[PDB]
Amino acid sequence: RNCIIGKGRSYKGTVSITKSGIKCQPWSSMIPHEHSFLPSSYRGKDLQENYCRNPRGEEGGPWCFTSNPEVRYEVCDIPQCSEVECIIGKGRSYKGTVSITKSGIKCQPWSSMIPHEHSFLPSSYRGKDLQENYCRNPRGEEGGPWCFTSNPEVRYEVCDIPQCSEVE
């Protein structure tokens, strides 16, 4: 996970370059800047290698001591986590808006019985977000999110949604 949530208190990624483009000094190094932010004094904050970190929780976000002797420390510019349209595992928790199947067929709305009559109504699956015609995996089947299809010859089909890469 190379994105930050909020100010990146939980950031444990591998970015090692500051906002202005300076290579980070290793946390366990005293060169060029002497400091006390050592891994042994900040257990759980993962002050490893020279990765940008926010061990105390400050505004700018994750930061590091810089290899430039003239710049003691500088914040790093890491993108905010914005991933959405992806699935974790087989997507029991998927609640995005993909509405086409793996074969390219437009999904039938869950509350519609046309062309396919079925039982997967929102009122019978409260909490599964069977809204609009979005792909869903309400019963937790290994096929991933699926939908009834608008092709009268294809009752249902799993959709094609890639795995996430920013969850944890």
Side-chain angles (χ1 to χ4, degrees), residues 140-154:
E141 319 179 5
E142 272 87 77
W146 58 273
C147 66
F148 295 94
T149 91
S150 64
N151 191 320
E153 193 128 341
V154 188

Side-chain angles (χ1 to χ4, degrees), residues 10-74:
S10 55
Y11 179 68
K12 310 269 168 77
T14 59
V15 171
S16 57
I17 200 74
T18 74
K19 228 207 158 181
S20 72
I22 315 172
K23 176 47 73 143
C24 289
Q25 167 185 329
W27 295 101
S28 289
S29 172
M30 285 317 122
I31 298 151
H33 306 292
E34 183 169 54
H35 68 93
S36 290
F37 288 87
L38 279 316
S40 46
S41 310
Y42 287 92
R43 329 178 282 282
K45 310 296 188 202
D46 195 44
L47 300 188
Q48 60 153 333
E49 311 293 335
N50 62 338
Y51 303 147
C52 302
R53 292 284 181 270
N54 191 357
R56 298 187 294 170
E58 271 150 89
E59 181 214 67
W63 59 275
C64 66
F65 294 94
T66 102
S67 56
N68 185 338
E70 296 321 349
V71 189
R72 173 149 173 103
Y73 55 84
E74 182 156 87

Side-chain angles (χ1 to χ4, degrees), residues 61-118 120-133:
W63 59 275
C64 66
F65 294 94
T66 102
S67 56
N68 185 338
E70 296 321 349
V71 189
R72 173 149 173 103
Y73 55 84
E74 182 156 87
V75 79
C76 311
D77 220 283
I78 302 175
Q80 187 75 207
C81 300
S82 61
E83 190 87 275
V84 174
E85 295 317 327
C86 57
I87 57 164
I88 300 145
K90 68 214 154 83
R92 295 191 310 250
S93 61
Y94 178 70
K95 269 141 203 197
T97 59
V98 169
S99 61
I100 299 101
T101 76
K102 69 159 154 92
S103 292
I105 312 172
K106 204 221 192 273
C107 289
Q108 174 185 320
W110 292 101
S111 293
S112 177
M113 303 274 117
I114 305 180
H116 304 297
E117 181 164 47
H118 66 91
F120 291 81
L121 292 188
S123 34
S124 314
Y125 288 88
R126 284 320 182 171
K128 302 310 172 183
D129 204 33
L130 300 186
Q131 55 151 344
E132 311 299 335
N133 67 332

